[model samples]
Target: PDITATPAWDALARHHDQIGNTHLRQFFADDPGRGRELTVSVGDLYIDYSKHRVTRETLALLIDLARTAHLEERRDQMFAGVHINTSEDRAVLHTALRLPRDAELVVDGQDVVTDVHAVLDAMGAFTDRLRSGEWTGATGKRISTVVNIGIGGSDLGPVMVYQALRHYADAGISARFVSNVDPADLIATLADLDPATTLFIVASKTFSTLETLTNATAARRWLTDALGDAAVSRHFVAVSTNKRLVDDFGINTDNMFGFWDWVGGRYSVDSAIGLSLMTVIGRDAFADFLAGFHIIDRHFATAPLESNAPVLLGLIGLWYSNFFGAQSRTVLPYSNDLSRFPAYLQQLTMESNGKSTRADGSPVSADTGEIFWGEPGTNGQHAFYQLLHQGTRLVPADFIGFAQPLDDLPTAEGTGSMHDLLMSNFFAQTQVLAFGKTAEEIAADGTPAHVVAHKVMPGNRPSTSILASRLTPSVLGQLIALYEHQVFTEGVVWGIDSFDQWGVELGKTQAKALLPVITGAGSPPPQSDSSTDGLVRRYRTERGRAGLE
Candidate 1:
């Protein structure tokens, strides 16, 4: 029998209708245990769903729903190396990268656990050498900077985490990520460094990735021009599955780290792909980050659906998507360090659950997912909060803030005013969203009677606030884990494979085929699609006229 046919889903669908229609203010006022009962803390992070429009009953029902979906079995299946990513015929085991030293996981007859540790050991050894100044470029200059070369997963994941946990970064070492295929990206990145003082980490699972290899080749040229061929030993390392290509590129085989086909690029920062990050923070902090990920993994695997942070977040998402008709979910994190946080989640949620198809490859009837977009707080308040507040569209949002600031700034009154302002916006937005001003309330505030109706704010906009003690390595880990599970819950409800990304492949394949024409090395065949052929012709003609031909 299919998992979706379980009675748990029926109960959840029924409970969703029963609990989701009410206002959050009413739910909180009606329940005495509202505050304490709704919030859960894991390590440094706290999930506060107390303000959401849900009750104890709703949570119990959702727990049943998670069980009905066989979440535990599916989670174990992934850990055990089942082909969870059916579309790609790969096991989804990025989680295993964070498993403790003694833990082992096997999938498809491969010892993935061993492979993960082997690469991690290699990463640690190389990182130790580089950090200790034992590794030097051809001119005997100790590497002072590291450049990560790759695109998409190779770029975003490490950069985001690095910025998020900048407090842990060591002194005298700097890391720059160059992923764009644009010549300007590499040109600018290579300008300031001595060829002997920079190490490049080429991070493409397949060494043939267009942007990655292009940048890698360009970087090699830049390094070789200065440091000569022998310089490759100290200046280049790779995190790739292609051993032959790594060797051919003059990378030291001992310096190479490998990840499996099972780990998707977007979710690979915790794997060997994070070599640059590991080097910057050292193995201790890197291990802390992994432990943090495992903590959330344990939570998602065991927690009841109703109280589960990820599950509840998903149910609220369903309320907004299916009932409230909101097209997008804005994730406003108050911290500046979390600037790329939204982009990370945008790819995670959108790429994972943005499918229109069911698990059986049939089309779905109800709305499936949301358009997730946002900037940090205060900035978003100035930019898009106007639309969220008064615009015609209903946008369900999440307000994530911390009680204490990582770096506090004083206000005009000389107290920690920045934190006060940040928290004020956090609390104020939830209140305004839930209990907006009435016409009478507006009129009493000295507004004219006629304009009061126009000014009168409609209440009942939905939102959830995620509060934490502080943003630490563990907290960031909790945040990522929380959302990873939330996307999983959504997939369970929609009956789709949240782990696979067949959609991203087609465009990448097209881009690869078009690159030759783009570079003016080839002419389009007559049988090519009109759109591709026209684009190629236009670009070729422009380049030819521009003196490239």
Candidate 2:
């Protein structure tokens, strides 16, 4: 039977019809303690869902839907290393990447926990050598800058974590990422670096990814051209499984780090894909980051549906996306360091859950993933908050903030804190979104009658507030794992394999086919659709190809 035909889904649909028009103000007024009661805690993070347009009944129905979908069984299967990703027939064990060394988890006739710790130990030893000034370049100088060359998951995860935990980088090492195949990306990244002091981590599972290999080849030429061919081994290492290709690229196969097919790229950040992050932040802090994820992993695995933070957050998102017709979600972090978080989540959520079919190959009866987007708060307030406040679309936002700033500054008056000022905006935006001003209040504030309507905000926007003590490495890990599990929960209910991303392959295949024609390599260009052929002709003409212009 279709999932929407289930009793729990029907009940929620009727509940939305009954209470859909109710305002958040009434919900708060009816239960003054709802704010405190609706919040949940996990590790160092506190999540407030009171501002969301959900009630006890709403949550109960959502939990019922979760049970109807057998989320518990699916989740257990994931942890047990069952092949939950049916399309790939691979176990989803990115969660196992963070499990403690002592914890035992066997999957596919192998001890996953032992394998995970071995790779982590190897990563730690390499990082320690680099930090201790033992790892040197061809010039026998200590490495200063590390450049990660990869695309998609490999690029986004490390870059995001590096920026987020840069303050913890006490090893005097810095990192840069070059992901785009555009020569400009590699050129700019390598422009200011010394070949003698730069190390490049070529991260691709297969060592055959087009963009990663292209940028890596350019970086190699840039290095060997400046130093020598022998410098290639000293400068380039890999985070891949293909030893033959690694050796062919002149990187020592011993330096290659490996992760299993069980781990998807989006979820592999906690795996060896975080080598650059581990190098920058040091192994101890990296362990804390892994520990943070472990906390949430255990919570998601053991906690009941009603009390689980990820479960509640996922259900609230479903309430908005499926029933309320919200098409997108805004992720607003107040920290300046988290500026790229929304983009990172765009790949994590959209790439993971942006499916049109269920795992069993049936078309979806309802909406799946909500389009994820946003910028850091205070900066966003000046730019897109206008539309968020008064736009016709209903956007459920998650406002993430830390109580203490990493680098606190004093206000001009010396009577207040800079972080406090930022927090004021963070807290105020959610309040304004949930309980916007009415026309009467606008007029009473001395606004003219004609503009009152324009100034009026509909005041029913839903959001969740996530607060932590500070933006520590552990906290960042917790934040990321929270969202990872939330994506998992939603996928379970939607009957989709969130672990697989077959949707990205078509473009990659087409791009591979079009490269020769685009570069004018094939004689007269291979046959293509009229639109593509015309575009290729124009491109060749612009590059001064014969007669086509």
Q: What is the TM-score of each candidate against the true structure?
A: 0.91, 0.98
lDDT of each: 0.79, 0.91
lDDT for model 2, on a 0 to 1 scale?
Answer: 0.91
Residue-level lDDT tens digits of model 2 in 163-211 = 8888898889899999999889999988889999999999999999999
Clashing pairs in 1: 59-306
Off by over 4 Å in 1: 1-22, 55-57, 450-454, 515-541, 544-549
Per-residue lDDT tens digits for candidate 1, residues 183-219, read 9999998888878788899999888898899999999
Model 2, runs deviating above 4 Å = 521-528
